[PDB]
Symmetry: D2
Subunit: 262 residues, 4 copies
Amino acid sequence: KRVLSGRVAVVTGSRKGIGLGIAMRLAMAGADVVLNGRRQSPEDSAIVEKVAAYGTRVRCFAANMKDRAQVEALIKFTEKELGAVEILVNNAGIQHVSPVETFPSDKWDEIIALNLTSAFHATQLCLPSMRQRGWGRIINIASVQGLVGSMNKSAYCAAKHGLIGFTKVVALETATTGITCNAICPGYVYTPLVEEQIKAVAEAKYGGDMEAATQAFLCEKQPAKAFVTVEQVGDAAVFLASPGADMIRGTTITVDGGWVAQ
Amino acid sequence: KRVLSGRVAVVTGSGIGLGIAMRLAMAGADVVLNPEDSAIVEKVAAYGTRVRCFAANMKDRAQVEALIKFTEKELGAVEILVNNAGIQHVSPVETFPSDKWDEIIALNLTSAFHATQLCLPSMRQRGWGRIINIASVQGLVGSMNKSAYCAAKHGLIGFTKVVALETATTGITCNAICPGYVTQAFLCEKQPAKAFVTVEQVGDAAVFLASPGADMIRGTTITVDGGWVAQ
Amino acid sequence: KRVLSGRVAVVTGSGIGLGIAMRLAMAGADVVLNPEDSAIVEKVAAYGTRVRCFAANMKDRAQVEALIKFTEKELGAVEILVNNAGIQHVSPVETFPSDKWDEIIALNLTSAFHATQLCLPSMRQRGWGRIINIASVQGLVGSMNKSAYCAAKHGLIGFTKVVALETATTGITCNAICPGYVTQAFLCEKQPAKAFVTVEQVGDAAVFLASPGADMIRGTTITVDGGWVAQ
Amino acid sequence: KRVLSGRVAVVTGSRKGIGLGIAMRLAMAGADVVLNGRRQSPEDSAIVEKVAAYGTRVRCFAANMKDRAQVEALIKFTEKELGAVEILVNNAGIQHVSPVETFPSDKWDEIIALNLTSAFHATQLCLPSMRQRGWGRIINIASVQGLVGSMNKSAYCAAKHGLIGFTKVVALETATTGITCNAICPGYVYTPLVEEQIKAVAEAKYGGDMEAATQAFLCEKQPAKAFVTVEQVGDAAVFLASPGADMIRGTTITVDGGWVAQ
């Protein structure tokens, strides 16, 4: 009795934050959801209850998306519990603010592996089932940082640009099938990833004042002067997964409050 | 009970506008328009919505004013503005008549400016609004013998960005939808999906843009092209 | 002896056009134009080039025809076309006068179309040509209170793409140059480099586009903005 | 007596092909050039003679750009022989045509490392000297595949998009200095990298006919129906290195014959 009823979806990362909203909105649309995260159980029970409040099957998994073996384990676990993976949301990623000169190479490697190559592993593993079933959705959670650059985020911007290019290529390789591949480019969304940066800014320039730090953080980049919600990103993902997006391929849905428009 | 129930919308052209109006009505909005077409327009009224027909030339600003006033007296304050008035003339730039260039700019580019200018104060007062501009992939990439059309679509996208920026802090959003083609070789040239884009899909994109989920979607494009612009 | 020696060029506006003409003359081209400005224009003739002044309203097509004929009789067949005619009006879209919107579109967008249409057959016959359209960063991103300007610049870039595609297989190329601002806070808002863009740099970009190295540069933008569009 | 006289430039890869043309045009502009390549000496003497025909100092080095130690060795060797690195042209890269499903992960890693991360290592190593000298140029040889996607080139498109995003970030981090960072996006250029693909296409669809294969290869993507030359890419690099590009930052110079315009 719902648009996504019976669909099995897999969110690869960000159990808290954007991944949470995406999972909630996919479950609201009737899809079973598997939430993957790099954490074990801080508040994961509350997250799973929030997702399962919509009466769909919900599962929780802990795979390091930098390890292809663990990505394959995640896919096979989803197949065992729910069924063939039909909606792959690649949302893993981290952030590290640093100028290029002092940017650690290990952090560059970590950001590339988690924000770019994990999507490659997950897509490579899930595409055969989607092709055999004749249907599939691959939604990559890119960033506005994948369309433009920001200071001291070289690795993140590179990985996000790369994830957009990968989206284009995958969409082209599947253009004639019922499988569509697209990307979402959110602006600032209040998440632990963004909360950490806000706290750093507050302690650096604003005497530890989180309110002023948040104000400056948004006013720098987002003309709307307000955060994008995880619910809105989830709505964008639901739209991309719906039949109306059957011919939406290789493009970007940007939810940024005007960040990129300027 | 629906996402768009209780909303007043106008489509300035059509026949993508027909599909946009149909999908908006299915979402609950009350829509205004501008042998088979008559059947489809009568069918649009079959979703419990107040649908009104109209025929206004969007080249004349006074006629746009008349359409807006007719909408706001017949149904109520305009809350969704779907600018879809457009004409296509295929010709090399050397032999492109200036009359058709002016007509294309007026109907595809300036008409949206007039309609937005007329409708914006009402949305400002009401604190909410959706301005959906029906551009095309020709507004992002170029195509041969489409000088006026591509220029108008690019300008429309630029105007979309500007309007969205000017209303970033309000409840009004402005965005553009860029469709592709709506037998095999013609699609193979431009659309790698080798299938057309239905008017229903464009209407779905418009409904999504008008839905609450797009409250923070401002000044960007929604490309429904089967991968045309991805290459 | 120079890269552009023996080339006939026209700049349709100015005062970036002055710098463009100066750098073109330094490269050896013979240029046509359209208290300190007089000194600079007299200085432009100090590079052994045949420089001619002119004052044509680019809104009227007949005046564009007159300028082209004057160029091709005074100096020779037009080989470089630098469209730089433009006017800026800053105003919110709600209060934006339609007259200024039409003027901006006519001077920034349609004038380039007329000039290109007039000049293209000569380049086709001669098998060579450069059409350099002076857009701006406002043609790529949006800015508040720049509705007409941003729309016109976006349309100009689209027309650039179309013209380049129509002449891909010939020796004629079409490209666009997008400059930024040409005290601290105003640059900090948009240009992260916090320094202006000289007219000399825009002229250098035009000279590069016109040089042989750009024989395969077609339909793209050259952005001289200190990083404005990179964010 | 030349625009780039006294400038020390380092080309990181593609000794044959685009790197050759870039080195030649930089030498013509008066700059000393160090050519780095993953090969030892097939025809490197002819390449060095072609570059040195313009009367500037020329050096040859063989560093694997996937190894940061070798990149540092290259930079230090340039400093020892010629002087501080002032014009860094990041041009290393390879290609591997394959659908996502069958794309080897090792080839993905190699393409990412050589086409994206090598630029990060070289830039990180060279930026301090440029900042201390108050001048510098960083030219990244991206591709049209960094602005759009092509089938069976997921790794290449991802890496090239990433290199463009990295260009944006580096330009932003140096916007107030005399150091500019930009990217060049060439279309098809007849090089061994492109010759190999052409030969594969010829043997696959055209009975081994290189002429028809080349025709189809160009007609697929480039409206101009002709190759971009290495000399033209070199000219774009020279323009980006010239004073006229003092305020060109974080942008792309696309030499593609109209590929991206459509």
